[PDB]
Symmetry: C3
Subunit: 317 residues, 3 copies
């Protein structure tokens, strides 16, 4: 009689379909998904330091809009900008807005140090009804609106040395009056000119008198500029009118900080990978949630599923 | 005696050489080419909507050069710009030319809507001998050259609200006169200044009086600018001279439109993939015709041939 | 009795560990390194034409700083800029510095041809104590500082046609005086304006009077500009003051030239691949020395070692 001895292998009743080099559909005993396609829907507050902008853009928090005073000197790994944010101060623009937003976002700090600028012979601390704090007229917290003192605006020629070990970031501006009479009334002379320089760089800005459409009832504008001053260099501001003056400087750091546009709620939880849709797990190598990411994240791909076989071909009975 | 039974495989007298991981030259029974290396030499008019610029650059068709009146309000999937195209109107430049060309190309339409700007107190519709239509003096069709009315040019302070559901694109300009006397003669005052604003943006441009080399016998220049106005925003033009005024706005759309530089003839035929050399078949995954493509195209690679084996090793008798 | 015949394979006592698709550590009999991780520490002078900037940036060699006269008309495949380089002429800036540096670097030549500009009615060849040659006052060799002649500066309206077969690169500038009295004293009128044009392009620059921090005891500045003039086009310079005039043009070539920041010594040796750390051998496909390369170089990767098996699995006795 003898015996029979058969060699074989397992199979399962519920196999899974994968792709190969020779066949788009072959059933294997088991597989694992390599594309992360879902989010929790919230941004976990840990382990990255999250700063929710709430009503404030980063730039409004920088300048010191009245809704943004709670942001002073705060730091972040990720600043989260909300689509509902809006300005509630004097109407302004920033030539190169994207670059200023980016460099501050990347620096990851709003640390500000006041300095004693000698604004000899002018009126300081100008305010406006378009920028209220607690119903009083106010202005951007970090800027100083200078105007005539007894119908004189003597030329400004003011120095601030950087004897620090770090770079200083200065934010300053130019006021564009609506009319010639408004120019004379604020600055006591027909036009201004502003030259802000260091040993390595110079910027000159000319105010442009005229009507723009009213925003918070104001037809004039402020245009915002910035200047970085290296250790051992010197800031020189030379102006005859229209200067929106700095009150001091911001620290610039380098590191891992960034900014993200999202309306996802912030939650008490821990997740390394952030997207605008919310935090996502980062076990998988790929993800199709969002091209926009921050942290230790899977790589964005177009596929919504990629199954890796983790078993042999399934050959059911 | 018994029998003999031999196992074997086919071969061919005309095998083809392919590359592998271990050998740069191995003969197989058959192969297929993966790189498309030839074109028909013409651009097929189907299935993409092709617009041949002929004598006109896209920007000349936009502004309304006298050779380009047939382009009014036309749409395209691909605008084809010819190397022979040249301007035949007033000499101009466009700071950022590449960006204006790109954004119009991508929008894919020259749809234009006239609007009723109230140009109170000036002469409209200025023309020039450098921009003839049918031997008369003429000008860019979409622009309005304003000059003094009885030696006055009163300040312009003109509004145009966008109460549409779409964005509006405005094209406008500044005239740079050749001399101080030409400035006075056209605008009745020593200089102009132009500020074009919305609630979100502002641009001011200063005319620059002086000689440039003569082009179509003109030593002055026009410089072209643009402004996009969102729904619920308002265009404000404020100027004292030198304004080359808009006559209305262009629609801006988003979609699949582009622009290509080519001198290939347009033909009656159907091909999904367009290159500057002509349309190419798109069965192959790769191509070495041109890095510049439009449509469903193979991917550009440096290799001129890549043969994929489609049979076994060829082992001839 | 019979015989025994065993099939087998070699092994070695000193195998090497490699990575595979199924195992991060498997021992093979032999392997070869695919990542170049060391440099000689010097830049080999062959076979690329190397130009050591020494004390000179490329831009200082272009303009003609007093420390850079030995660079006149020199050509390079690779211009090597040293971190110790510093300027020793009139303090200047270049809006777009990076682009001018890049285009000259890529052109690979400082070939300069003097031209006879007719500067009618002004004093030529102005000099300064901030730009000495051999203790005399001097200036940038390739620039011509024009000032009043007997308290007149009549308007300049000067032409230079390009009747060559190649493009011409013109470098020119604007002087920004420290004060109104300095402006009058040099140019005999209250301000200048400079318009430099061709048939295709125009640039106008306004001098900006004011104090900048002293550099080599000078509080004024020069700002540098450039203009390319195609064959059959014409350069037109129109100015009433403050012009830092060209003396002629640079040839612009196209080819394989570039620029590299490095403090590595130049040596007498032959190596195709240059990095800032020094030349590296280029037998390997990859390297982790520097992302910055010039010549026939391995590709930069993050790994510091990648071992390719060149033998079978090692199975010791
Ligand atoms: C189909 O094929 C897949 C892939 O092979 C199988 O999925 C694996 O299943 C095993 C067993 O369930 C999983 O193992 C468990 O996950 C963790 C593994 O530890 C590593 O990964 C985690 C991430 O979760 C890291 O944080 C960690 O540092 C390790 O690198 C453990 O958390 C689990 O722990 C449990 O067992 C241990 C044993 O000591 C205990 O300490 C704990 O109490 C706990 O109960 C466990 O080890 C593995 O994660 C799965 N991989 C994937 C990719 O999903 C399927 O099982 C298979 N299906 C079938 C039917 O065969
Ligand atoms: C060497 O190796 C190559 C690659 O395997 C072989 O080339 C193939 O040859 C076959 C047979 O000639 C070709 O088949 C023909 O092409 C079309 C295939 O249909 C698909 O592809 C077309 C693109 O052309 C798509 O539009 C379509 O939707 C399909 O996805 C058909 O158009 C042809 O149709 C003919 O036969 C059918 C049969 O029903 C009829 O309906 C028609 O009347 C018509 O006569 C046909 O099927 C195939 O395209 C070739 N592939 C490639 C990549 O070239 C060589 O044959 C082989 N050489 C040797 C000597 O063995
Ligand atoms: C472990 O595995 C590695 C990889 O297989 C082996 O390394 C190879 O070893 C051989 C033998 O020593 C090396 O061969 C020598 O290198 C040159 C080969 O010529 C080509 O490559 C050079 C670059 O060096 C090119 O310039 C040239 O154009 C060729 O493309 C030759 O320079 C050497 O020449 C010597 O022998 C010839 C024989 O005719 C003579 O003319 C000369 O006099 C001279 O003495 C020689 O051919 C090969 O380069 C190595 N490759 C690598 C990648 O390192 C190890 O040998 C192996 N180890 C063990 C223990 O098995
Ligand atoms: C130049 O043109 C602009 C734009 O048309 C003019 O601005 C407009 O000025 C009027 C008159 O002051 C503004 O009216 C105000 O509206 C508010 C809002 O309801 C109201 O509270 C005030 O009582 C007043 O009615 C109008 O808002 C403003 N329009 C825009 C778009 O800004 C400007 O007056 C013109 N200048 C001259 C000198 O003509
Ligand atoms: C400032 O410099 C420019 C450039 O040299 C001068 O422009 C030149 O002006 C002359 C005189 O009008 C032009 O001559 C004309 O040439 C045409 C072409 O054949 C001809 O049809 C006319 O009858 C006349 O001869 C010349 O073309 C022009 N050159 C360029 C390059 O534009 C300008 O005159 C100077 N201005 C002053 C005030 O000196
Ligand atoms: C406008 O503000 C600037 C900056 O404070 C003033 O520039 C400064 O001018 C003084 C007076 O000439 C310079 O002093 C000089 O220092 C050198 C260096 O040791 C020395 O050799 C001279 O004898 C003299 O003491 C000073 O260097 C300079 N500072 C900077 C940062 O450039 C300028 O004077 C002010 N202008 C007016 C009209 O007030
Ligand atoms: C640069 O700063 C200087 C120093 O105050 C200014 O020059 C003075 O300007 C006033 C008013 O215009 C004149 O009365 C003085 O005679 C000037 N002094 C000197 C030494 O020239 C100058 O106006 C400043 N520039 C700008 C753009 O504000
Ligand atoms: C995560 O959010 C992104 C961003 O909105 C979503 O991507 C958009 O998906 C819609 C379809 O609902 C498309 O119309 C848009 O093209 C996508 N937006 C952009 C800006 O490209 C995505 O659906 C979300 N993913 C998950 C898993 O929630
Ligand atoms: C901005 O528009 C206003 C409104 O017309 C202009 O201001 C007037 O300018 C004229 C002529 O220069 C003066 O006579 C009026 O007194 C001004 N009116 C007011 C209310 O100030 C102004 O010129 C325009 N700006 C530009 C750059 O064109
Ligand atoms: C398609 O057109 C391109 C564009 O001109 C051709 O590529 C050029 O080829 C010439 C050789 O005749 C080279 O000198 C140039 O470097 C290429 N041009 C550019 C701009 O890089 C190409 O030969 C054409 N291909 C086919 C298949 O017709
Ligand atoms: C452009 O060049 C012309 C030609 O010299 C200059 O125009 C002359 O300017 C002088 C002095 O300002 C006047 O006296 C003449 O009447 C002008 N001539 C003409 C024909 O207008 C003009 O100043 C130059 N522009 C610049 C910016 O320098
Ligand atoms: C070649 O030079 C580069 C450039 O400095 C070196 O890379 C730097 O390595 C240091 C560590 O000593 C890091 O802190 C820096 O991040 C690197 N620099 C930059 C600018 O990224 C590199 O070490 C050198 N490699 C060799 C083989 O000598
Ligand atoms: C510093 C100063 O003088 N501020 C005044 C401003 C400016 O004159 C204009 O805003 C300039 O355009 O105007 C107000 O109507 C305002 O904005 O509230 C009153 C305010 O006191
Ligand atoms: C609107 C207007 O006044 N147009 C006139 C222009 C301008 O004066 C200059 O072109 C400005 O530079 O000059 C002409 O010689 C021309 O170009 O044909 C006559 C023409 O009637
Ligand atoms: C051409 C000319 O007039 N050069 C003079 C300059 C300029 O007046 C200023 O540098 C302009 O800012 O000033 C000097 O002190 C200098 O720099 O050496 C004296 C020099 O002879
Ligand atoms: C098959 O069934 C087992 C037991 O219910 C389960 O654990 C396994 O994961 C199932 N299917 C797939 C596709 O993973
Ligand atoms: C933000 O603004 C809205 C009004 O637009 C208000 O309801 C909300 O309380 C504000 N929150 C903060 C923190 O300023
Ligand atoms: C070999 O010959 C056959 C018949 O002539 C042909 O169809 C085949 O495609 C030939 N060669 C190659 C390289 O394809
Ligand atoms: C285009 O311009 C050339 C002259 O340069 C002319 O021959 C041709 O007829 C013109 N065609 C059109 C459509 O304007
Ligand atoms: C092993 O030893 C031989 C002879 O000493 C040597 O040539 C070989 O390269 C050695 N090891 C490795 C890791 O290459
Ligand atoms: C470069 O400058 C330094 C002084 O900073 C000097 O020692 C050296 O000799 C100079 N060399 C040349 C070639 O100018
Ligand atoms: C200017 O200097 C050059 C030498 O650099 C000389 O040829 C020329 O004659 C000088 N011109 C004047 C007007 O001084």
């Amino acid at each position: 009689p003898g015996a029979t001895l058969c060699l074989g292998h397992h199979a399962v009743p519920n196999g899974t379909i994968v792709k190969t080099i020779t066949n788009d559909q072959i059933e294997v005993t088991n597989a694992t998904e390599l594309v992360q396609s879902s989010s929790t829907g919230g941004i976990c507050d840990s382990p990255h330091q999250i700063l929710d902008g709430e009503n404030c853009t980063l730039i409004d928090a920088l300048l010191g809009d009245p809704q943004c005073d709670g942001f002073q000197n705060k730091k972040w790994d990720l600043f989260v900008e909300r689509s509902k944010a809006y300005s509630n101060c004097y109407p302004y623009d920033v030539p190169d807005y994207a670059s200023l937003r980016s460099l501050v976002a990347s620096s990851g700090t709003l640390e500000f140090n006041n300095e004693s600028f000698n604004w000899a012979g002018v009126t300081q601390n100008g305010t406006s009804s378009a920028c209220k704090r607690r119903s009083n007229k106010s202005f951007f917290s970090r800027l100083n609106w200078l105007t005539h003192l007894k119908y004189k605006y003597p030329a400004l020629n003011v120095t601030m040395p950087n004897n620090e070990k770090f770079d200083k970031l200065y934010i300053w501006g130019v006021h564009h009056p609506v009319t010639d009479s408004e120019q004379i009334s604020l600055y006591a002379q027909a036009s201004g000119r502003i030259t802000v320089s260091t040993k390595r760089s110079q910027q000159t800005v000319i105010p442009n008198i005229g009507f723009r459409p009213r925003v918070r009832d104001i037809s004039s504008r402020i245009s915002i500029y910035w200047t970085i001053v290296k250790p051992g260099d010197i800031l020189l501001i030379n102006s005859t009118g229209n200067l929106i003056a700095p009150r001091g400087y911001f620290k610039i750091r380098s590191g891992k900080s960034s900014i993200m546009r999202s309306d996802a709620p912030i939650g008490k939880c821990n997740s390394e990978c952030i997207t605008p849709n919310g935090s996502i797990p980062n076990d998988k190598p790929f993800q199709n949630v969002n091209r926009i990411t921050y942290g230790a994240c899977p790589r964005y791909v177009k596929q919504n599923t990629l199954k890796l076989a983790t078993g042999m071909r399934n050959v059911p009975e």
